[PDB]
Amino acid sequence: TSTIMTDYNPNYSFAGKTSSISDLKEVPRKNITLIRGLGHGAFGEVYEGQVSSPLQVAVKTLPEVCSEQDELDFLMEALIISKFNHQNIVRCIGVSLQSLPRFILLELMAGGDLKSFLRETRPRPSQPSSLAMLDLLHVARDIACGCQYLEENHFIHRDIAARNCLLTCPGPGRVAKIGDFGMARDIYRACAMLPVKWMPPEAFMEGIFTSKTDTWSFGVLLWEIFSLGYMPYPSKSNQEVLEFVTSGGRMDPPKNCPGPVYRIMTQCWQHQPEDRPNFAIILERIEYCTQDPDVINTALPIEYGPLV
Ligand SMILES: CC(C)NC(=O)[C@H]1CC[C@@H](n2/c(=N/C(=O)c3ccc(F)cc3)[nH]c3ccc(CN4CCC(C(C)(C)O)CC4)cc32)CC1
């Protein structure tokens, strides 16, 4: 049992209901086995694990060497993810906070993060039809569905970006889900690290956030998706992007991007928040793109390399 989690005992409210550490589902430590590291994420290394044939999970761990504020951050992360209920948001199996190091147990996303996926699964001479337009539109729909759920529930994400989206598996039938809430977590509990390149004009100027903030960011996510994992605003630094965007500058279409898809991006990037579509409208426009043969029959560019 943690001293400062129990000393502070923060409440978390979502959708008009309040929760605390006692609502989290504590899984006995003896039921949890770590299998392998999966890379660096929230709070450091994320691990593949199994609970109690067993349940496969991703495990975030809290470093035993950490501040009181890191502890509170970890608790709040558990509270936030445990209260969401949507198929396009990673599930929380539970927590193990009463042994050290402390764990949060999450849905295992075998496909990894979307940015790395797009970069590694780009069409190439060795894998010429590794992805098609419809694969990209399905990822877009999946994430817009998760964002619509957050909007409906008045939760502002603030960091919708390909790096924070995960895939259930690499192969066909993959489902994309929002897999990080670290920015929202920090804001709930209270610059060279802000995600400037995903932020609308009114964000870094006035510090005003609404769900139309997430709409802007979703537009940038769409560019990330249809570019196959390029960094937004190629060649521009954070301050160059800030000045560019606040003066009306917008990204060009990604290579081979169909016009109807690019038009969704440019609507998401309307200077005035009121002119930006909500996620219901974004979903309708993604569906229309998905039904249009000229969109879905467009070939993605082949990135040059060897046959092996
Ligand atoms: C900020 C957060 C979204 N990112 C992370 O936590 C990172 C660290 C874990 C990492 N990850 C990972 N994370 C999670 O499952 C996870 C992370 C956070 C959660 F809240 C929930 C689940 N699962 C992973 C499974 C595999 C792999 C390895 N990858 C599989 C696909 C493969 C291909 C097909 C592209 O060639 C390349 C190698 C990585 C996995 C995702 C990125």
PDB file of all heavy atoms in Angstrom, residues 33 146 170 210:
ATOM      1  N   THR A  33       2.813 -12.305 -14.556  1.00  0.00           N
ATOM      2  CA  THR A  33       4.175 -12.627 -14.974  1.00  0.00           C
ATOM      3  C   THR A  33       4.578 -11.770 -16.152  1.00  0.00           C
ATOM      4  O   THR A  33       3.852 -11.715 -17.137  1.00  0.00           O
ATOM      5  CB  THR A  33       4.329 -14.099 -15.424  1.00  0.00           C
ATOM      6  OG1 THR A  33       3.791 -14.974 -14.426  1.00  0.00           O
ATOM      7  CG2 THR A  33       5.817 -14.432 -15.658  1.00  0.00           C
ATOM      8  N   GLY A 146     -13.202   6.634 -31.431  1.00  0.00           N
ATOM      9  CA  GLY A 146     -12.686   6.897 -30.081  1.00  0.00           C
ATOM     10  C   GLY A 146     -12.747   8.367 -29.688  1.00  0.00           C
ATOM     11  O   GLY A 146     -13.105   8.697 -28.558  1.00  0.00           O
ATOM     12  N   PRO A 170      -0.722  -6.602 -36.308  1.00  0.00           N
ATOM     13  CA  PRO A 170      -0.195  -5.992 -37.540  1.00  0.00           C
ATOM     14  C   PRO A 170      -0.982  -6.357 -38.799  1.00  0.00           C
ATOM     15  O   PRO A 170      -0.994  -5.589 -39.768  1.00  0.00           O
ATOM     16  CB  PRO A 170       1.238  -6.533 -37.618  1.00  0.00           C
ATOM     17  CG  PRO A 170       1.234  -7.786 -36.818  1.00  0.00           C
ATOM     18  CD  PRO A 170       0.203  -7.603 -35.741  1.00  0.00           C
ATOM     19  N   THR A 210     -10.818  23.108 -26.163  1.00  0.00           N
ATOM     20  CA  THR A 210     -12.188  22.585 -26.295  1.00  0.00           C
ATOM     21  C   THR A 210     -12.068  21.295 -27.122  1.00  0.00           C
ATOM     22  O   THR A 210     -10.960  20.917 -27.485  1.00  0.00           O
ATOM     23  CB  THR A 210     -13.110  23.584 -27.024  1.00  0.00           C
ATOM     24  OG1 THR A 210     -12.702  23.702 -28.393  1.00  0.00           O
ATOM     25  CG2 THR A 210     -13.093  24.980 -26.354  1.00  0.00           C
TER      26      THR A 210
END
